[PDB]
Design a protein around this ligand. Structure first.
Ligand SMILES: CC(=O)N1CCC(Cc2ccc(F)cc2)CC1
Ligand SMILES: CC(=O)N1CCC(Cc2ccc(F)cc2)CC1
Ligand SMILES: [Cu+2]
Ligand SMILES: [Cu+2]
Ligand SMILES: [Cu+2]
Ligand SMILES: [Cu+2]
Lengths: 286, 287
């Protein structure tokens, strides 16, 4: 009942209402809760000793962020019942010679790249320094939003459309030991550790700035449109592989299994396996 | 009103045994680690960023946060054993003793004893000793055992007394602006222990030492829950005395500190946990 559109197919009002609603949540102090939640899960290892955490590098990577975006979208609609979370189709932006000139990086939406003159501090758009305060790992002020498109050796370019399709061809959702080293795994493949960095992981490194590391990534509002696309690819995969379900169903590390509570919530992957059941849908399904 | 919360000294041998085992079950399942993480995560959620106030401490939300914290915890106990309830450690009566480190609460059948100076004060007695109990650090990585150092600090060589508790109950205002560590004439700040600190709640932490000495790793010691159960009790008693004194601020305080503001990392508000009886439990001193 709640359509989630593509950024390029948004009206000027839809772009305006979305941005404005985010700034309100920021002013209310609700936005910082999500920044903290994301960082808090990143240090919750399942189990302690492994490199697997509640939100990343394991099987719960996809359902966690789905619930994450869901709650966020719910807080959006508590302000404006018409606003929904759009998605950034970065696989299509890769077609451009220079993706930074895309309409998603316009001054009326997310702003542009960082300014090399000003330590790559974002000085354009509604989320520039002085109009948008960011925090660091410890929860202290950091001094502005940063962005450095394709300035990394491991990720100088965005992933391609072919990368997305090759990921959808995978049969298993995930494979043991449900981590960074999982092979033939759609979860691990979409995350981006298969000959990394790729896809989701590559996009983070590509954007740079706060998006470059896990604990500070949600400081950039593009984080939510990026994962909305990640959530879409997962949704499409479920539609293709109707007979394939979430893995592991159990006996994986606690907090990674199908009926396990996902820190820091009581929500289980089962509770968020069907995005239609959650009350939203993507425009490509219509 | 149906779930009695008793005193550790008033517990049977069976009740102590059942409680301890239940804690060990939650630990093995991986549920216990959630609370350690929750506590540490709120300690770095500053309200607002820049200030010394966090979601769980050094502010007005200190008391309702831990009440909800203990509430959720007590519920996870009953998911295992529906008869087990969370006891409280009356540290004010232990202060009466010549040596508090001799309380029956520090016996091998409950919480174990003090730390071993030979092995960096690692606990080697009780059900939560090294090898029977794994602990984690700030970053969420294994730390290698529980520590305890009773009264080894200059600013907290002794536990707080009954008079400290009484004098705190004599305070009229729940809290005062700027609703933080420097609040004066505040029951919250008093009971927390920043008034000539460390005192009361804060002093107990520093007294026990080890993981209990710092905020992010404090829940690694199961005594953390019996300690805050006593802190919650004193708060409950204060509410009974001053029935028309309510939570402050009702508004205009930092977000997450107000009466109807969600307490990170939950959606629970101080209003939702203002009446402990409505939460489904009571303390034995009320009967
Ligand atoms: C490939 C690589 O080493 N990285 C490490 C950094 C990481 C960044 C990141 C940030 C937030 C997330 F929720 C997930 C991942 C991307 C993958
Ligand atoms: C007085 C003092 O400086 N402290 C700092 C250390 C702190 C310990 C502590 C641990 C966990 C809590 F939930 C609350 C408090 C007690 C107060
Ligand atoms: Cu994430
Ligand atoms: Cu991400
Ligand atoms: Cu605490
Ligand atoms: Cu405490």
């Amino acid at each position: 009942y709640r359509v989630r559109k593509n950024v390029l197919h948004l009206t000027d009002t839809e772009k305006r209402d979305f941005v404005r609603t985010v700034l309100i949540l920021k002013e209310k102090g609700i936005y910082d809760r999500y920044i903290a939640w994301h960082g808090a899960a990143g240090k919750f290892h399942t189990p302690p000793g492994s490199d697997r955490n509640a939100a990343h590098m394991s099987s719960a990577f996809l359902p966690w962020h789905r619930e994450y975006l869901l709650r966020f979208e719910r807080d959006l609609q508590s302000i404006n019942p018409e606003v929904t979370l759009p998605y950034w189709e970065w696989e299509t932006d890769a077609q451009m010679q220079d993706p930074s000139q895309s309409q998603i990086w316009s001054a009326d939406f997310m702003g542009g790249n960082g300014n090399p003159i000003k330590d790559f501090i974002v000085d354009t758009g509604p989320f520039a320094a002085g109009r948008w305060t960011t925090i660091d790992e410890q929860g202290n002020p950091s001094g502005g939003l940063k962005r450095n498109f394709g300035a990394t050796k491991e990720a100088p370019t965005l992933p391609t459309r072919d990368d997305v399709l090759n990921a959808l061809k995978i049969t298993q959702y995930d494979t043991p030991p449900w981590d960074m080293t999982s092979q033939n795994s759609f979860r691990n493949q979409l995350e981006g550790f298969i000959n990394g960095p790729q896809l989701h992981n590559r996009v983070h490194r590509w954007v740079g700035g706060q998006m470059g590391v896990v604990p500070t990534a949600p400081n950039d509002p593009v984080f939510f449109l990026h994962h909305a696309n990640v959530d879409r690819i997962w949704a499409v995969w479920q539609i293709i592989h109707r007979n394939q379900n979430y893995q592991p169903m159990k006996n994986g590390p606690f907090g990674q299994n199908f009926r396990d509570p996902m820190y820091p919530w009581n929500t289980t992957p089962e509770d968020v396996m069907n995005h239609r059941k959650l009350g939203y849908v993507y425009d490509i399904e219509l």
